[PDB]
Enzyme design. Structure first.
Site, short mmCIF file in Angstrom:
data_model
loop_
_atom_site.label_atom_id
_atom_site.label_comp_id
_atom_site.label_asym_id
_atom_site.label_seq_id
_atom_site.Cartn_x
_atom_site.Cartn_y
_atom_site.Cartn_z
N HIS A 44 49.79 52.66 32.31
CA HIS A 44 49.83 51.20 32.45
C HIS A 44 48.56 50.51 31.96
O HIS A 44 48.56 49.33 31.63
CB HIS A 44 50.20 50.76 33.87
CG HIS A 44 49.08 50.91 34.84
ND1 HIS A 44 49.17 51.80 35.88
CD2 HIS A 44 47.88 50.30 34.89
CE1 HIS A 44 48.04 51.70 36.54
NE2 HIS A 44 47.22 50.83 35.97
N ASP A 93 53.59 57.40 35.06
CA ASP A 93 52.40 56.61 34.78
C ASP A 93 51.20 57.54 34.51
O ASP A 93 50.39 57.82 35.39
CB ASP A 93 52.13 55.63 35.93
CG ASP A 93 51.13 54.56 35.59
OD1 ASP A 93 50.73 54.45 34.40
OD2 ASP A 93 50.73 53.82 36.50
N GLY A 186 41.40 47.30 39.33
CA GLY A 186 40.27 47.92 38.62
C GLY A 186 40.09 49.40 38.93
O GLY A 186 39.32 50.09 38.26
N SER A 188 42.82 51.56 39.02
CA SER A 188 43.89 52.36 38.45
C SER A 188 43.42 53.22 37.29
O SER A 188 42.44 52.90 36.61
CB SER A 188 45.07 51.50 38.07
OG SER A 188 44.68 50.66 37.00
N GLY A 189 44.10 54.35 37.16
CA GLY A 189 43.75 55.34 36.15
C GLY A 189 42.78 56.38 36.68
O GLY A 189 42.68 57.48 36.12
C1 LIG Z 1 34.62 42.63 34.05
O1 LIG Z 1 35.80 43.52 33.92
C2 LIG Z 1 36.78 43.31 34.80
O2 LIG Z 1 36.82 42.40 35.60
N1 LIG Z 1 37.72 44.29 34.66
C3 LIG Z 1 38.96 44.37 35.33
C4 LIG Z 1 39.42 43.47 36.30
C5 LIG Z 1 40.67 43.64 36.88
C6 LIG Z 1 41.52 44.68 36.48
C7 LIG Z 1 42.90 44.81 37.03
C8 LIG Z 1 43.61 43.72 37.55
C9 LIG Z 1 44.87 43.93 38.08
N2 LIG Z 1 45.48 45.12 38.11
C10 LIG Z 1 44.80 46.17 37.61
C11 LIG Z 1 45.50 47.48 37.60
C12 LIG Z 1 46.73 47.46 36.68
C13 LIG Z 1 46.42 47.31 35.20
C14 LIG Z 1 47.29 46.56 34.38
C15 LIG Z 1 47.04 46.41 33.01
C16 LIG Z 1 45.89 46.99 32.44
C17 LIG Z 1 45.03 47.72 33.24
C18 LIG Z 1 45.29 47.89 34.60
N3 LIG Z 1 45.86 47.95 38.94
C19 LIG Z 1 44.92 48.69 39.66
O3 LIG Z 1 43.75 48.83 39.27
C20 LIG Z 1 45.32 49.18 40.97
C21 LIG Z 1 46.33 48.78 41.69
C22 LIG Z 1 46.65 49.33 43.01
C23 LIG Z 1 46.70 50.72 43.14
C24 LIG Z 1 46.96 51.29 44.36
CL1 LIG Z 1 47.05 53.02 44.49
C25 LIG Z 1 47.17 50.53 45.49
C26 LIG Z 1 47.14 49.14 45.38
C27 LIG Z 1 46.89 48.53 44.15
N4 LIG Z 1 46.94 47.10 44.05
C28 LIG Z 1 47.88 46.22 44.39
N5 LIG Z 1 47.49 45.01 44.09
N6 LIG Z 1 46.26 45.16 43.54
N7 LIG Z 1 45.90 46.41 43.51
C29 LIG Z 1 43.54 46.06 37.09
C30 LIG Z 1 41.05 45.57 35.51
C31 LIG Z 1 39.78 45.44 34.96
#
Ligand SMILES: COC(=O)Nc1ccc(-c2ccnc([C@H](Cc3ccccc3)NC(=O)/C=C/c3cc(Cl)ccc3-n3cnnn3)c2)cc1
Ligand SMILES: *[C@@H]1O[C@H](CO)[C@@H](O)[C@H](O)[C@H]1NC(C)=O
Length: 237
Positions: A44, A93, A186, A188-189
């Site tokens: 993702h 995923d 932030g 995930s992965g």
């Molecule tokens: C300056 O740089 C930045 O600001 N960087 C920065 C800021 C925000 C994000 C980001 C925002 C939203 N979602 C994610 C991704 C999903 C994602 C989607 C597309 C590309 C990459 C990642 N999901 C998680 O990370 C995790 C989700 C999750 C996982 C588990 Cl196991 C339990 C509960 C969760 N959540 C539910 N709602 N939120 N988290 C990432 C990424 C980089």
């Protein structure tokens, strides 16, 4: 990571921060070193990624503030996404990044073992989720890599919490029934790392959840042991 605590230098040497340089450089996702030129992460993560040329893998990083112009990084040769992947909630995923160079292992950067296929009946009780993600739904990336110890939840209990989603045997859930600690935006992965018999194993890949650390809403992770053959297949290609 919600309710996490700061990690120290060298504590999670398989954890990487994956950055995108387009349009501007920023942390995108976590990942794990699993081999000499291989990072395991979530499929993702690559939704908005134009090509592997815009990715940078940073290893041996504790603080995001350590990432500057001359900071050493690994370029990405190829992004390998599971060919059945459609969306996080429907599974598959998982993705590999083939790096442009091999990784010399040090105290700050080394691989984590994949879980053993013989360790299917194994009860993991020392599991940790790590990352630079938010500390609550509306927050920002954290500077210092955070960690939280989280218990695994059975697939049957996890399925009760997510009536609108299919929780398959290719997923693993983790979190406190009473909430409070979990991965968040932030993270995930990155890895769900379990220490078993004094060896760390990459049990899960942070994938999705409903909100962050909410009561009776565990985080959902890709169940790595169910992809061992796919990983071996792609890493020998
Ligand atoms: C300056 O740089 C930045 O600001 N960087 C920065 C800021 C925000 C994000 C980001 C925002 C939203 N979602 C994610 C991704 C999903 C994602 C989607 C597309 C590309 C990459 C990642 N999901 C998680 O990370 C995790 C989700 C999750 C996982 C588990 Cl196991 C339990 C509960 C969760 N959540 C539910 N709602 N939120 N988290 C990432 C990424 C980089
Ligand atoms: C790894 O170590 C060898 C021997 O010190 C060195 O020649 C090589 O440049 C290093 N490679 C990388 C990718 O760091």
């Amino acid at each position: 990571i919600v309710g996490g605590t700061a990690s120290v230098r060298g504590e999670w040497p398989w954890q990487v921060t994956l950055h995108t340089t387009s349009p501007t450089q920023r942390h995108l996702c976590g990942g794990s070193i699993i081999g000499n030129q291989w990072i395991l992460t979530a499929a993702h993560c690559f939704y908005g990624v134009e090509s592997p040329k815009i990715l940078r893998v940073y290893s041996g990083i504790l603080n995001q503030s350590e990432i500057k112009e001359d900071t050493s990084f690994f370029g990405v040769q190829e992004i390998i996404i599971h060919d059945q992947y459609k969306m996080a909630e429907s599974g598959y995923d998982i993705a590999l990044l083939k790096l442009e160079t091999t990784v010399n292992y040090t105290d700050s950067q080394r691989p984590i073992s994949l879980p053993s296929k013989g360790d299917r009946n194994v009860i993991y009780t020392d599991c940790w989720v790590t990352g630079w993600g938010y500390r609550k739904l509306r927050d920002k990336i954290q500077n210092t890599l955070q960690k939280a110890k989280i218990p695994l939840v059975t697939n049957e209990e996890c399925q009760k919490r997510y009536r609108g989603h299919k929780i398959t045997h290719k997923m693993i859930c983790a979190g406190y029934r009473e909430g409070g600690k979990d991965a968040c935006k932030g993270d995930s992965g990155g890895p769900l790392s379990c220490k078993h018999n004094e060896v760390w194993h990459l049990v899960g890949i942070t994938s999705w959840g409903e909100g962050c650390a909410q009561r009776e809403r565990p985080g959902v992770y890709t169940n790595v042991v169910e992809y061992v053959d796919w990983i071996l297949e792609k890493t020998q290609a």
